[PDB]
Amino acid sequence: QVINTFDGVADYLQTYHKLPDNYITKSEAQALGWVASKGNLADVAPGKSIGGDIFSNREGKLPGKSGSTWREADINYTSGFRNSDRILYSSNWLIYKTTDHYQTFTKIR
């Protein structure tokens, strides 16, 4: 099976300290041919979801420890345009969720 659910990815991150093999950055996706406005990710990178890019967190929505960095990954993606579901994970593996395109977050771990 493909690890792309909230619990599946949350557990993987906290245990393996990295995203599963089905995640690729936006820049890797783009170089493969992903064109956001065409929603072709599943055509150009079968089985992959966007994940691993740094999330800025300038709006102070997520709780940053002094030297921590936040990263994000798409959740529940299989085909077409990207959805609004994302998993947010910190340097010390704090896990947050958003289902409203980064408007609001809730802790899941």
Curated annotation (Swiss-Prot):
Keywords: Endonuclease, Genetically modified food, Hydrolase, Nuclease, Secreted, Signal
EC numbers for this chain: 3.1.27.-
Molecular function terms, GO-annotated: RNA binding; RNA endonuclease activity
Coarse class of the protein's main subcellular location: secreted
Kinase recorded as keyword: no
Active site per the UniProt annotation: E72, H101
Subcellular location(s) of the protein: Secreted
Family designation: Belongs to the ribonuclease N1/T1 family.
Job description of the protein: Hydrolyzes phosphodiester bonds in RNA, poly- and oligoribonucleotides resulting in 3'-nucleoside monophosphates via 2',3'-cyclophosphate intermediates.
Name of the protein in question: Ribonuclease
Annotated organism of origin: Bacillus amyloliquefaciens
Lineage of the species this protein comes from: Bacteria, Bacillati, Bacillota, Bacilli, Bacillales
Whole-protein residues included: 49 to 157 of 157
